[PDB]
Write a protein that binds this ligand. Structure first.
Ligand SMILES: [Zn+2]
Lengths: 120, 100, 68, 69, 112, 96, 55
RNA sequence: AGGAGUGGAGCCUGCGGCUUAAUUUGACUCAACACGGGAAACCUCACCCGGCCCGGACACGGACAGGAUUGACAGAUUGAU
RNA sequence: AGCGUGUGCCUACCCUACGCCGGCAGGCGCGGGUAACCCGUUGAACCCCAUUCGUGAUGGGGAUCGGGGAUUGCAAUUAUUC
């Protein structure tokens, strides 16, 4: 019920707002990620991924797409969907919160299970 | 007018005897020449393990060249310098010439 | 050998025999006519034809699809 | 009062983005809400903090015996 | 690389050693073996063949090298030639003891 | 094994004038060094002249990271039969 | 397709951009002075180059 | 006779054990344990989860210019134009 | 102070002085060196001199942890590094 705000800007005026000031508003790691030229020489996977996220279903539960790339920088244009992610064996079917922005997709996909110790 | 003759090799005795050959030729041609000057010999140190596997006492081997370098200055025209560097060639030494 | 995963084959070329009949047509006289268009690219040949699908087509060496 | 912006312990906050220099109760409350934010967001660092292990990703096979018995 | 190439090549001609002589516009090298009539080939075909081999392989301009062939004197005093001769004797199915006695007798007859 | 027909003829005619070619042992780097005037691969050349070795026209021995090859009388006879040239011309391998 | 699937990983750096010039291996390389070869092939072919033991 | 220490505290690294789709393996007193020049994010890679290409030369018997295969754009597909 | 190192066959990754911007790590032009020539008289550390501290887990020790800023790379999340 509380109006959550990310870095002092609200959801609408971070949604319709341009990439270079978005890069300015991001931290130091995401600045170098987006400020090193066009994302076409190697990031064609990321290109096809966020355009497949850009195409949108009608008013129901969102479509599921699966990713083999855990190094995705969360953008405002692709927030609020339903994405499964590969961890190495299976697919982690996870939901995108509005607070994903500024993180990586591999951080929310746990790879190693917690261990338990019995008799050595 | 100022031609510079650079001599480099690995064996020292062959290098000093061909330097003696050059200085004796320059003496018998009766022209002003300067004797050889000795740079420090740069060592070529590479240290590596002995055994192929990872078993045994930690033993190391040390290998070296001895690159001896000398150069002389000739106050002489270029044609006699060309014929001297054309004659008396041996595989022990390497002859390098330059002019500026 | 026969594993758990089933075997899936590639694009097998079906034996479409007498395809030369689809190249040209014969009228009453010795004149000729075609039902396939001509690719005007320099990388395409003067006699190289272009494919025939329900909406668009496909070239040979050119691989250009002219769409409206 | 003429203090540079980079000389602060908290820059570009997640809620307002202003440059704040927190105090003892302020830093304690902010660390508590940050820990509960990672626990609610269910990230890897939040799971490591909930389990009570190292979060910076180093070796703990040989060290770290002071955590429990 | 040249020594490894010639040891891989002349396994039957009894290769002994090679030397490289530096000279401007003439990269002169001289081969040495226990027999000189077999390293040339038929009317000197193999020698210019390997000359073309090294000129094409080592990136030198054509006509830079000119390979000669010299028979080594006192062949029993070279360890490479005696080892290759003993390898040839062992490759024929001969016993090791008779071949070893023969090569050691030849070595002491050479004057070692 | 889908070599274009110009490539095998090009290999054969460069083999005719000088009866040896060298190849770096690498199936990854495609561009031949001294065939710089045309687009010629390396693994196709390697497999084709390995098939020539399997037939027995050439003799092949190995090195550090390189290959060497030979042309015999039967090899140059097969090359002249394939290229359809009269025997009045002689390769430089069998000439002074 | 296959021609760009074969060339996907660049070889501008890393250990895979170089190998031994004799045994073709990627362990224990000597990048000093353009040897570009492993230490044990170097031990096998040391004294022929001129690497002789004085120290 | 001594000097510096280690073993005690924290940290780095290796091994054993436990766990794991997999936590790849050699080396267990001197004469293994910052050893394989082994400071592994991708190649390394030898381990696992997934799909492509042949990188099956050459002989024998079938197939063949009327045709033996590779090279793909429209919409579903993993992971990828 | 002394061993050394420094622009490469596949290759494209070298050493850096000088002049500005910035606390900082870093950024652009400016030039040399295929090397006793240029970095470089390699103004290194320890040590010396003068204040502050005063037996207190203390200004010792810096493990653990939060945020921000830079370079490398095609990509650093399981903090690459600073
Ligand atoms: Zn066309």
């Amino acid at each position: 019920f509380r109006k959550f705000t990310y870095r002092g800007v609200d959801l609408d005026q971070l949604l319709d707002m341009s990439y270079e000031q978005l890069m300015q508003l991001y931290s130091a790691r995401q600045r170098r990620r987006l400020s090193r030229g066009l994302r076409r020489k190697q990031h064609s996977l990321l290109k096809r991924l966020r355009k497949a996220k850009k195409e949108a279903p009608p008013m129901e539960k969102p479509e599921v797409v699966k990713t083999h790339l855990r190094d995705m920088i969360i953008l405002p244009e692709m927030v609020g969907s339903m994405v499964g992610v590969y961890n190495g064996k299976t697919f982690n079917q996870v939901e995108i919160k509005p607070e994903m922005i500024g993180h990586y997709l591999g951080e929310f996909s746990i790879t190693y299970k917690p261990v338990k110790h019995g008799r050595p | 007018h100022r031609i510079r003759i650079t001599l480099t090799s690995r064996n020292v005795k062959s290098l000093e005897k061909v330097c003696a050959d050059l200085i004796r030729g320059a003496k018998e041609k009766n022209l002003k020449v300067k004797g050889p000057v000795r740079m420090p010999t740069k060592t070529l140190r590479i240290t590596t393990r002995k055994t192929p596997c990872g078993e045994g006492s930690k033993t190391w081997d040390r290998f070296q060249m001895r690159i001896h370098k000398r150069l002389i200055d000739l106050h002489s025209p270029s044609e006699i310098v060309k014929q001297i560097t054309s004659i008396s060639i041996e595989p022990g030494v390497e002859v390098e010439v330059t002019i500026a | 050998k026969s594993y758990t995963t089933p075997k899936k084959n590639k694009h097998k070329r079906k034996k479409v025999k007498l395809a030369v009949l689809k190249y040209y047509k014969v009228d009453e006289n010795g004149k000729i006519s075609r039902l396939r268009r001509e690719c005007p690219s320099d990388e395409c040949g003067a006699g190289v034809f272009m494919a025939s699908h329900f909406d668009r087509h496909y070239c040979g060496k050119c691989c250009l699809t002219y769409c409206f | 009062y003429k203090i540079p912006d980079w000389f602060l312990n908290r820059q570009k906050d997640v809620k307002d983005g202003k440059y704040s220099q927190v105090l003892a109760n302020g830093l304690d409350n902010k660390l508590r809400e940050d820990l509960e934010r990672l626990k609610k967001i269910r990230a890897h660092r939040g799971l490591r903090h909930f389990w009570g292990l190292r979060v910076r990703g180093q070796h703990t096979k040989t060290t770290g015996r002071r955590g429990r018995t | 690389e040249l020594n490894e190439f010639l040891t891989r090549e002349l396994a039957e001609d009894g290769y002994s050693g090679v030397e490289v002589r530096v000279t401007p516009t003439r990269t002169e090298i001289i081969i040495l073996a226990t027999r000189t009539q077999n390293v040339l080939g038929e009317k000197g075909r193999r020698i210019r063949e390997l000359t073309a081999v090294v000129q094409k392989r080592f990136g030198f301009p054509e006509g830079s090298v000119e390979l000669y062939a010299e028979k080594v004197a006192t062949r029993g005093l070279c360890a490479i030639a005696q080892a290759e001769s003993l390898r040839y004797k062992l490759l024929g199915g001969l016993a090791v003891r008779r071949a070893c006695y023969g090569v050691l007798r030849f070595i002491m007859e050479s004057g070692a | 094994m889908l070599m274009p027909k110009k490539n095998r003829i090009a290999i054969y005619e460069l083999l005719f004038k000088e009866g040896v070619m060298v190849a770096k042992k690498d199936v990854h780097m495609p561009k031949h060094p001294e065939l710089a005037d045309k687009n010629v691969p390396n693994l196709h050349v390697m497999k084709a002249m390995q098939s020539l070795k399997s037939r027995g026209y050439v003799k092949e021995q190995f090195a550090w990271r390189h290959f060497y090859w030979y042309l015999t009388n039967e090899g140059i006879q097969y090359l002249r039969d394939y290229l359809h040239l009269p025997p009045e011309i002689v390769p430089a391998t069998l000439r002074r | 397709g296959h021609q760009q699937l074969y060339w996907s990983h660049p070889r501008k750096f890393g250990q895979g951009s170089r190998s031994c010039r004799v045994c073709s291996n990627r362990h224990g390389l000597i990048r000093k002075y353009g040897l570009n070869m492993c230490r044990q092939c170097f031990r096998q072919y040391a004294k022929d180059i001129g690497f002789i033991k004085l120290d």
